[PDB]
Amino acid sequence: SIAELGIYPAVDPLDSTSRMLNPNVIGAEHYNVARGVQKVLQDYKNLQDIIA
Amino acid sequence: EILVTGIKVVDLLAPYQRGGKIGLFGGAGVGKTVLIMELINNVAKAHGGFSVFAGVGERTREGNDLYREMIESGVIKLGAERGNSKCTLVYGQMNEPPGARARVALTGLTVAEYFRDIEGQDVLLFVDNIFRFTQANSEVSALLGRIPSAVGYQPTLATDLGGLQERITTTTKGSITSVQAVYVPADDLTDPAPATTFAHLDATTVLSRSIAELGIYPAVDPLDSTSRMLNPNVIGAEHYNVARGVQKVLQDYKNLQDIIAILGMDELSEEDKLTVARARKIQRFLSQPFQVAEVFTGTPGKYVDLADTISGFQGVLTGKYDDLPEMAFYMVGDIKEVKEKADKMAKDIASRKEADNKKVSEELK
Amino acid sequence: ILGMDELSEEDKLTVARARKIQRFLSQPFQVAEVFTGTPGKYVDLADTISGF
Amino acid sequence: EILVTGIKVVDLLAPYQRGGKIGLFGGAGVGKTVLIMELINNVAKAHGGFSV
Amino acid sequence: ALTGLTVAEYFRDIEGQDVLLFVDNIFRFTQANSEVSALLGRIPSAVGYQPTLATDLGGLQERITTTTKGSITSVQAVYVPADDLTDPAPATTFAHLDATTVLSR
Amino acid sequence: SNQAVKQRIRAIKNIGKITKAMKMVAASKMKNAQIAVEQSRGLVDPFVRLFGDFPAVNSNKSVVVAVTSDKGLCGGLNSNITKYTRATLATTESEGKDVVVVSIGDKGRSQLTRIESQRYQLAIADTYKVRVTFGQASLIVEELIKHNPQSYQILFNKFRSAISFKPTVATILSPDLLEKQLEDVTGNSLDAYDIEASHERSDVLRDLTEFHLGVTLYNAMLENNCSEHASRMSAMENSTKSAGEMLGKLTLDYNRKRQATITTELIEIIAGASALM
Amino acid sequence: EAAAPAGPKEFTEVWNKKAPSTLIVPEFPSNYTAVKAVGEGQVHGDAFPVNFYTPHSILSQAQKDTVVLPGVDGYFGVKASHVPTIAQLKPGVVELHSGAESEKFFVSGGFAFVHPNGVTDICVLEAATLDQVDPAAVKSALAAASAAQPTDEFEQAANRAAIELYSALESAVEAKA
Amino acid sequence: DVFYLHSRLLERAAKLSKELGGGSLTAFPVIETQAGDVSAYIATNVISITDGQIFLETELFYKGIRPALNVGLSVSRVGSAAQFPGMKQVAGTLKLELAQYREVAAFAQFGSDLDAATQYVLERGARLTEMLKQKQFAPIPIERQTVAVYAATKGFLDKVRVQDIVAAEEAVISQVNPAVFKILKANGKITPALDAHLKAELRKVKLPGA
Amino acid sequence: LVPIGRGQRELIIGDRQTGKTAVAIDAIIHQKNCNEQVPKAQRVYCVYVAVGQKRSTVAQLVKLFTQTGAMRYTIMVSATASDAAPLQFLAPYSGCAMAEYFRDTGKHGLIIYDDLSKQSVAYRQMSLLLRRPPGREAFPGDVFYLHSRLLERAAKLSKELGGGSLTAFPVIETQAGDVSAYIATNVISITDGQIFLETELFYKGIRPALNVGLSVSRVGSAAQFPGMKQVAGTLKLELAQYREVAAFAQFGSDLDAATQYVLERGARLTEMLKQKQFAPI
Amino acid sequence: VGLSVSRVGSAAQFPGMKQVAGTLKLELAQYREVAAFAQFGSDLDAATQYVLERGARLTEMLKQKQFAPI
C-alpha cells in the first residue's frame, strides 16, 4: 500500500525494525530522531482515518 | 442471433443467444424456478420447436404443478392426442437417491440430442437445477474410494461437468437452446461447482438475494449478469450503448452505497443526487410482474417487447422521465404503463374518502 | 449531550425511580459477613414482588 | 416451578427454574465466588438440599 | 463432571434432597471432551470440535433434571470462546441453558 | 482474503467513534448558542408589530436572501431551504419582477447555483468562522443596500427545538417606495405614530428599514447557526447508528468467515492425513 | 395606493397554488409574537409593559411606570398611556424606573417605539450600564475626537458623532448620584 | 448427503391424488439459526426443499411483538390461492398495509420528518401489528380471525392510539353476534348479504379505547 | 503504462467477466498488422492455447482469426472441457513446445495460456486420483512447479543460440478480486508483470478494465516504443494523482479549484484509455 | 492496559502502590473511553478535556528506557 502511494522504495516505515536501534550502540541522537519520525508517522496513521 | 424473451432486465442487460446456453444462478429463495417458468411461458410457446424439461433434483410438487399446467395449457395432450404434444419431461426429482439424480440430466440431454441430431430441429432443453447433478456426484464420490477435493466436492468435478455441458451446444444439423438453473450452494459464488459452471454458459443471468430482499422481482443482479450477445456487432449500436449506460449508472450507485449508508443522501452533491435518482428509477424499472407470478399476487403479467425496453430504458437514462417518482417504476410493464401508474399514483393521494353514505349497507334491499 | 436538568418531569421521576431501584437490587450476603461485618438478609419472593 | 435462591435480582428478573440449568457470564473480581457461596448457603439453609 | 453428577445423583435420589450443582466453566468440559475425541482418532467436526459434541454434552446435561424424588439445579459458568454466539460450543451449550445471569464490571 | 473484513471493521468502528464525538460537538454547540438566540429574538417582534407582515407584495425589484450553513454536515437543512427558496420565490412572481438571489454560507453557492443562477449575484461565505456579530450583519446589509430593491425576503430556519426546523421568510420592505404605501388603510395607520425625528418621516423610515434589515439578517444568521448545530446533532446520531448496524453486520460476517476458514483448513489437514495412512 | 392585499394568513393560500402540495407552509415572524399593536388595553393602571431590547441581549422585559428616552429633540419621559411614537434617540442615557427604584442605562443610538396599546419597545444597539463605563479615558477619547479634523464629510459625520457621544458620556458621568 | 437426508425426509409430505385415497400430510420442520443468517448450510438446504418459510426474527421478538413473523421474508406461494377465501379478501389488503408499514418504518428509523399522510400508514401499521400479535397457547379459529382482521384492515379501530388493541380484539370478538361466526365459517367467504351485516355490527361496538 | 517486451512473461489476471481474453486477442490480432509491415526476421508468430474452455468458444475464435486473417500466423491448441484432465494438464506445455520451435530458430514467438487456473484444476484431478496427498485447498504442493516449469520456458535467448524470443501471456481467473487465492499467488510471483483487471471498473466504462494502480511490469520502460517513453512518463503519474483526489472528493465535502483540475485532467485520461472490442491502434 | 489484566488483582499488589494504582487505572479507564477525541482538540467540554490531558499525563508517565529497572 506504500508502493501504491508511489514511495519507491516501498519500505514500511513503522514495522521495519532492527536490533541496531539501541541508543547505547549507535548513539542517542540517531535513536531520538528515529523514534520521533516513527511517532510522527504513527500520529499521521491514526489521523488518516479522520483525514480520509 | 437474438432470442427475444419478453423480460426487461433479461432482454436489456444479458440477452439470450438463440443458439447458445442460458444460466440462472440462484441462492435458495431468489426465484430461479419462477423465472424459468416465466421463461417457459414466454419462449416455449412462440418458439415452435420441441422442448425438453429435465428436472434434476428440484421439488416434486413443482413437477406436478408443471404437469397440471402443461396439460391444461395444451402443451401436453393426453388420450388419443399424444402426438400433438410439444414437451417431454424427464424427472429425477429430489426424492431419488444420488445415483438417480446423477444421471437424469444425461437422460434429458439424450432426449434433446435425438431431436438435435436425427430429427434436426431446434430444441429447448430446460434443465432444472443442474447443480444437483454435481451434488449427487459428490455424495457418490465420498464412497467411491476417492479423496475429497475443494470445499467438499469431487476430484473429477471439472471433466464431468464438461462432459455434460459440452453436449448441449448447437451443431450444424440442429440447435439446442439450453436454459439451466444453477443453484449456488450457500450464496457462495466461489464454490467450485458454480465456479466451474460459469465457464460453460453463453448468457449467464445471476439472481441475487439482496435484490429479492428489496422485493424487486425478478431479482436479477444487473451488474453481474452478462452475455456474449451484449456486443455492438449483433444487436445494433443503440441497444449496446443504452445497455452500457444503464450498467454505468448502476455501477456508480453501487459505489455510492457505502457513503449513502453512513451519511445519507444529504451529504452528496447535486449531480450525485441526479445519478442516485436515475439509478433508483432504473433499478426499480427492471422489475416486472410476471405472467406465472399472477397465481399468488393478483397482478396481471406483462410481456415487454424489446423496442419498448429500449425506449423506456433510453428515456430514463437520458432524463425524459425524471419527474416521475420511484414507485411509478415498481412492478410495471413498460414506459407507457409507467405514466399510466403515475396517473393512478397521483390520483389516490387526494381522493381517499367519501364512502359514508350511498352504500348498499342499509337493511331493506 | 444536553444536560442533567434538561429532561422533562415525566421522565426524571423514572430516572429517580431507576436510580433507587438499581441500588435496591443489591443484597448483603451472609457468606461475606466474615469480612464485611454486616450480616446477610435472605429475601423471600412474595416480599420481593410486593416491595418492588 | 421456581427456585427461591433469596437474591432479589435472580429471583425477580431472571428466575432460577427449579431443576433447570443456569448460565453465569462471569469474569474476574466481579464477586462470582461470593455469589456461588451465598447460593449454596441459602439453598442449604432454606430448601434442605446440599450442593456440589 | 460425571463424578459431580454422581454425588449430586446420590444426594437427589437417595437423600431425597433439592440439590445444587456447579459445573465450573462448561466450555472447558467441552474442551476436554474435544481433546479426548481428537485423541482417539475420530475425525474432528466444525470449527475444531469433536464429532460427538452434541451427544456427549447431552449425556452430561440430561442427568440434570427434576425427578419425582428430588431435583438437581445446576449453575454452570459459560465462557464464549471468541465472544461469538455462532460458535458451536455456546450454540450447543445454550440449547440446554434455561436462565442466564450476566455479571458486569 | 480474511484481512479485508477485519480492516473494514477497524474503519467502521473509528467512523462510529468519530460521529459519536461529533454528536457531542454539535449538541454542545447547540447550547452555547441557546444563550444568545432567545436574546437575538428580542428585536424581531417590535418591527413586525410595527410594520405588520406583508410578504405577498408586488415588488418591482427584490433581494431574496437564503442564508445557509458553512460545513456540509447539515442533514435536511441546506437543500430544504434551497427548495423553499424557489417555493417562496415562485408564488411571489406574477408580473416579472427583478430578483436578486443572495445566499449566505458556503453551502448556498453549491446548491442555489443549480436552480437559479441567472438571478444570483452575491454569495457571502465564512460567516460562522468565529461567531455571529452585529457589525457583520450591518456590513452585509449595506452590501445589499448598495442596490435599491423594493422589498427583501429572508429565508432561514427557525430553531424552535432540536426536532422542528420550520423555515421562515422575514420580510423587509423599501421605505418610501413600498413600506409607507402598504400602510395606506383609510389614510395611514403609521401617522398615528407621532414622529420624533430630525428630518421628515421619509428619511427616518429609510433608517428604520435599514435597521430592520440588519437586525433580521443578524437573527437569521444566528438562528440558522443554532439550527445547523441542531441538525448536525440529528445527523451525527444517525451516522452513529448506521456505523453501529454496519459494524454489527460486518462482525457477524467476520465470525462466519473465521469459522469457514478454520473448518476448511482443518478439513485440509484431515484429508491430507487420512489419505496418507 | 394599497393595491397589494398581502398578509401572513393570505400567504398560505397563495403558497398552496404554485408550490407542490407536499411541503408545510413556511412560517412568518407574525406567528412568533403575541404582544401586538392595536390590541386595545395592555395598560392596567400605572404599570405599562416595557420591552427593552438589544441585538445580543435582553436586559429588561418587566413592567415599568416611567421610561425617559434621549430623543433628538431632547430627553422625554414615557408614561403609561403614552402617545404612539417613532423616536430616533440621541446617544445618551435611558432611565428605567419601576417606582421607588431607579436604574439608568447609557444607550448608544437607536430607535424607540410606543404603540397604541401603551406598550414600549426600546430598540438600541449597545445599551451599556453606567457601572461598566469609565470616567478616565472618556476625556482622552474626546481629546482624540477634538483633534482629528480632516475635510471628508464621512469622517466629519463619524467625528461629530464621536464628539456628541463622548460629551454625552461626560455629562452622564459627572452628575451622578 | 445431508441434502439427501433432509430431502428424503421432507419429500413424503404430499397431497395425494383422488384415486390414492385423497389424504394429505403437512410438514413443519424447525431449523435452529445462529445469529439469524439465512445463508448457512442447513438453512439454505432446507429452504430449497420446503414449499415456503416462516421467518421468526429475533429483533421483532425482543420488542414484544410475539409471534415475531418477519412478513417480508416469509413467503408461502402454494397456500396463497389455496386458502380460506373470506380471509383472502381482506388479507391481500392486509399484505399491502404491512408492506407499506415495512417500507415507511425503514424510511423512518427515527422521527424527524412528518408528512401527515405517511403518518396514516405509520399509525395503521402499528395498529395492525398490535392486532396480529397474540398470547401463547391460544388458538384462534378462522371465523374469529376473519372478523378481527376485517375490523382492523378497515376502520373501526383507529379510535385507540396503539395501546388497548389487546383489549379491543377480545372486545370486538365478544361484542359481535356469535351467529355471524357460523355464517362466515359455513359460507366460506364474506357475501354482501354478510358484508352489510359486518359493516352494520362493527359500528355499535363498545370499544374500551377513547 | 504496462509495456510488454519480447521475452517477458506478462500475466493477464481478472475476475470472471472482465476483458481478459479480449485484451489477449488484440495482441494476436495486431500481429497481423505489424507482420505485414516489419521485415521477415522480426516477425511474431502467435500461439493461443485454450485450456478447459468451451468448444463453441474455440470455434468462435478460429471464426474470428480466419475473419481477420490472423490464422496465417496462429496455432490454436484447444484443450476443451470435453478433454480429460490429463489433456488439459498437458496442453499449456505442448503449446509451449509448438511455440518453442520459433524460439529455437531465431524468430520471435508469442504464447497465450488461456486460463491457467483451469490447468491447475486438471492437474488437481489426476493428483487426487493417483493418490497424491493434497496440500492447499486441494492442490498438491508442487503446483508451483507445475507452472514454473512452464512459464520459465518463455525467454529471450542470446545471440549465439539464434537470438530468438518467446513472450508468454498466462491468464488467471480469480473469484471476487481474490488475489490471495492459492493458484493466483503462484503466478503473480513468477511472471514479470501483472495486468490485473477488475469488474467494478469494467462496468464503470473502463474497457479494458486495467486496474492501473495494481498493474506493473518489472521489465519497465527499457522495453517499450521510444516515442511513448518520453511522453507517457507523466501518464502513469497523472493517473496516480487521479485516484487519491477521487478518493477524497467522493463524500461531497470540499473542492480546491486546482485539485479540481487534476481530477479533471485525469478524467480526460481515464476516458482516453478506453478501446473497442477488436481494434488494434 | 485495556486488555492486559491480572486475575490475581490488587490483592497481592504492593501497598502504597495500591493506594495510587486504583485511581491511576480509573482515570486511565476514563481516558481510553475519552480517547480518540484528542484530534478534536479545539472542541472542549472542560471536564472531558481535563481527563483527556490527565490521561495524556499518565500515558506518557509510564514509559521505560530499555533495561531501566526501577
Ligand SMILES: Nc1ncnc2c1ncn2[C@@H]1O[C@H](COP(=O)(O)OP(=O)(O)OP(=O)(O)O)[C@@H](O)[C@H]1O
Ligand atoms: N475493449 C472492450 N470494449 C468493449 N467491450 C469489451 C472489451 N473487451 C471485452 N469486452 C466485452 O466484455 C465481455 C467479456 O470479455 P472477455 O471475453 O475477455 O471475458 P472473459 O473474462 O474472457 O470471460 P471468460 O474468461 O469466462 O472467457 C465480452 O462480452 C466482450 O464483448
Ligand SMILES: Nc1ncnc2c1ncn2[C@@H]1O[C@H](COP(=O)(O)OP(=O)(O)O)[C@@H](O)[C@H]1O
Ligand atoms: N416474478 C415474481 N413475482 C413475485 N414473486 C416471485 C417472482 N419470482 C420469484 N418470486 C418468489 O421467489 C420465491 C422462490 O421462488 P422459487 O423459484 O420457487 O424458489 P427457488 O428459486 O428456490 O426454486 C417464491 O416464493 C416467489 O414468491
Ligand SMILES: [Mg+2]
Ligand atoms: Mg424451484
Ligand SMILES: [Mg+2]
Ligand atoms: Mg477467458
